[PDB]
């Protein structure tokens, strides 16, 4: 899980 975007 990226901390700066929820985009895949």
């Amino acid at each position, epitope marked *: *899980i990226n*901390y700066y975007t*929820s985009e*895949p």
Partner: single-chain antibody, 231 residues
Framework: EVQLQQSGAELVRPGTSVKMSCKAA????????IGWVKQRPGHGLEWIGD????????NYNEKFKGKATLTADTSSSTAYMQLSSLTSEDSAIYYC??????????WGQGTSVTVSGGSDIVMTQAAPSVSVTPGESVSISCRSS???????????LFWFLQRPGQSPQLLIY???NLASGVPDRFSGSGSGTAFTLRISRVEAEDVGVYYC?????????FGSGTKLELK
């Protein structure tokens, strides 16, 4: 179980601000994005933005930059949204939802507020409604203005049902995958730009509005909805 418990209805006047809350429980608050969604009559569902309560980083639909502010308090596991310069356009029900690996599978119950982009992916649902008799099967179509296929091999198309007086619920994730708790009467297929939700053996619990949504790229976008009703 995951719970998202939102603050109560607000009756407010134009020109003011309001701040609403979304108390999270049943999972690690700082691990997942929380998104916010606007349900305004005649305007389907509209995605406002999201926030990561670990980093505090937020992303907004440009349409809401200067309207909505997302914050989080890690001490109380609560997400907040503040709206400024309230107008009639802001009268709506607002939902928080937990993003589970791109799935909006957990939704708050909504907060009612009553006020007394060219490159965005356009999601279209040609049928405003479908009218069926119980036990019939039905197909509901959606199209996206660009491919929803990602380099990773997944197609980031989602189907939701919003039953009358309820929050949206996730039915199908990444084009074809059946969401937990959803009967296998529901299925999804598609080409990456055109999609079909199929419902076998329709029953009264299936009544409501079906929305497609893309979670490929910001801002996330929903179709206009197709209302299913019984004849």
């Amino acid at each position: 179980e995951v719970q998202l418990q939102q603050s109560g209805a607000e009756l407010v006047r134009p020109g003011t601000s309001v701040k609403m809350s979304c108390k999270a429980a049943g999972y690690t608050f700082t691990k997942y994005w929380i998104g916010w969604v606007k349900q305004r009559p005649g305007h389907g569902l509209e995605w406002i933005g999201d926030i990561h309560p670990g980093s505090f980083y937020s992303n907004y639909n440009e349409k809401f930059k200067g309207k909505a502010t997302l914050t989080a308090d890690t001490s109380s596991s609560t997400a907040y949204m503040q709206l400024s310069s309230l107008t009639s356009e802001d009268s709506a029900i607002y939902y928080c939802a937990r993003d589970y690996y791109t799935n909006y599978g957990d939704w708050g119950q909504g907060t009612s507020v009553t006020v007394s982009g060219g490159s965005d992916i356009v999601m279209t649902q040609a049928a405003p409604s479908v009218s069926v008799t119980p036990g019939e099967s039905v197909s509901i179509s959606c199209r996206s203005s660009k491919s929803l296929l990602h380099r990773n091999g997944n197609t980031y198309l989602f189907w939701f049902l919003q039953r009358p007086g309820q929050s949206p619920q996730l039915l199908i994730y990444r084009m074809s995958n059946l969401a937990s708790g959803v009967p296998d009467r529901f299925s999804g297929s598609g080409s990456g730009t055109a999609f079909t939700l199929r419902i076998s053996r329709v029953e009264a619990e299936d009544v409501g509005v079906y929305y497609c949504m893309q979670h490929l790229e910001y801002p996330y976008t929903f179709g206009s909805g197709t209302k299913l009703e019984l004849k």
